[PDB]
Write a protein that binds this ligand. Structure first.
Ligand SMILES: CC(C)[C@@H](C)/C=C/[C@@H](C)[C@H]1CC[C@H]2C3=CC=C4C[C@@H](O)CC[C@]4(C)[C@H]3CC[C@]12C
Length: 160
């Protein structure tokens, strides 16, 4: 469930918001392009605190499909204008075994830190809409790669 409990971003809350979710989508597009993905759509601005992002993810697993599409729903859930905000991703990947029976939900918690730093926690969980003996492989499939995805995102986020 709890991917990363406390990373610290040496940049203010409002700028981390702008850098990952601002109306200039070029940073997040570079971020997303760096996580083993291709055929990335043109990254939309948020409208009504929601935006859709599509791409194909290359997989190196035991023997999944070894690539799958991803239809990602990204929404800004909570905005306390000074102390914290939170973004929630719902990620569908129809091409994998038992796709359309689940989605991956990841919450990105960003909070005002000391001398106006930003610390983030990342929490995910699979929501199920169908039975599947694969349940516990997908569940730890989601957690495992999300762990990797967060590592690249904070790795690229600090560089700038
Ligand atoms: C045996 C097979 C069927 C197993 C391994 C399939 C695992 C899939 C479902 C996993 C592996 C990589 C995972 C994956 C990696 C990284 C991210 C980035 C994150 O920001 C949203 C979720 C997302 C997109 C997830 C979704 C679920 C994926 C695509």
């Amino acid at each position: 469930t709890v991917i990363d409990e406390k990373i610290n971003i040496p940049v203010p809350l409002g700028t981390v918001f702008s850098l990952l979710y601002g109306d200039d989508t070029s940073y997040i597009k570079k971020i997303i392009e760096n996580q083993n993905n291709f055929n990335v759509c043109d990254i939309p601005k948020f409208v009504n605190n929601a935006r859709e992002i599509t791409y194909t993810k290359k997989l190196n697993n035991s023997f999944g499909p070894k690539q799958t599409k991803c239809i990602v729903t990204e929404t800004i859930e909570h905005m306390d204008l000074n102390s914290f905000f939170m973004v929630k991703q719902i990620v569908r990947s129809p091409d994998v075994p038992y796709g359309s029976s689940f989605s991956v939900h990841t919450r990105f918690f960003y909070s005002w830190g000391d001398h106006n730093t930003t610390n983030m926690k990342v929490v995910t969980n699979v929501v199920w809409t169908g039975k599947s003996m694969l349940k516990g492989t997908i569940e730890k499939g989601s957690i495992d790669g999300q762990r990797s995805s967060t590592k690249q995102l904070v790795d690229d986020l600090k560089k700038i």
